[PDB]
Amino acid sequence: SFSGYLKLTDNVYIKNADIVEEAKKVKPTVVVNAANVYLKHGGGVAGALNKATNNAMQVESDDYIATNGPLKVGGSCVLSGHNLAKHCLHVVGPNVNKGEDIQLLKSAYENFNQHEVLLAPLLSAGIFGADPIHSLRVCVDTVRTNVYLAVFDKNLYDKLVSSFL
């Protein structure tokens, strides 16, 4: 169902797209959220995905945290995808702006290997403060399942493709 993606490797694909609009169109089995440990979906990709669910993602997430406690940096949980996907895989990449360890980015991408196909953003990019070129390199070298990356910013998309090794 994914269309218009540039193939980077055997299993990694990329497109300049808004992941909310992509999720509404494709209705994938799994959409990845760029989550934090508290599942507080305030801004970035998480704020956008939650807004698109009319805050239902945040209501479900607050119940999950009340029962289970916070996730680990590098960890994940599977929740509903609401109106966007069958499931949302909430993945916590390190937040460099909070001083978190960038070596946890590979552990974060390992969560994707539990799902055959995913629609995802680049982990730890955007407001999480990591270099998106590094994030794409770790993604290609860690994920073995089929990943469709949506990059919101056109200028960043072009730089990611042009500099891809």
Ligand X SMILES: O=C(Nc1cnc2[nH]ncc2c1)c1ccncc1Cl
Rule CB under 6 A: choose which of 15, 27, 40, 51 binds ligand X.
Answer: 51
DSSP conformation class of 122: P
**Residue numbers followed by a gap, the chain, C–N over 2.5 Å:** none
Give the range of 41-49, 70-78, 100-108, 131-139 binding ligand X by CB under 6 A.
41-49
Give the range of 18-26, 61-69, 87-95, 129-137 binding ligand X by CB under 6 A.
18-26
- Per CB under 6 A, contacts with ligand X among 85-124 are none
Q: Does 17 bind ligand X (CB under 6 A)?
A: no
Residue with CB nearest ligand X? 48
Instruction: Choose between 68 and 152: whose C-beta lies nearer to ligand X.
Output: 152
Total interface residues for ligand X by CB under 6 A: 11
Q: Does 44 bind ligand X (CB under 6 A)?
A: yes
Residue 118 CB partners (closer than 8 Å, separation 6+): 28, 29, 30, 31, 32, 89, 112, 145, 146, 147, 148
The letter for the amino acid at 128 is: F
Rule CB under 6 A: choose which of 45, 85, 123, 130 binds ligand X.
Answer: 45
Instruction: Choose between 112 and 128: whose C-beta lies nearer to ligand X.
Output: 128
Q: Which residue's structure tokens are 């956008």?
A: 48
Distance CA 79, CA 17 (A): 23
For 99, other C-beta atoms within 10 Å of its C-beta total 8
Rule CB under 6 A: choose which of 12, 14, 17, 19 binds ligand X.
Answer: 19
Handedness of CA 138, 141, 145, 150 (dihedral sign): positive
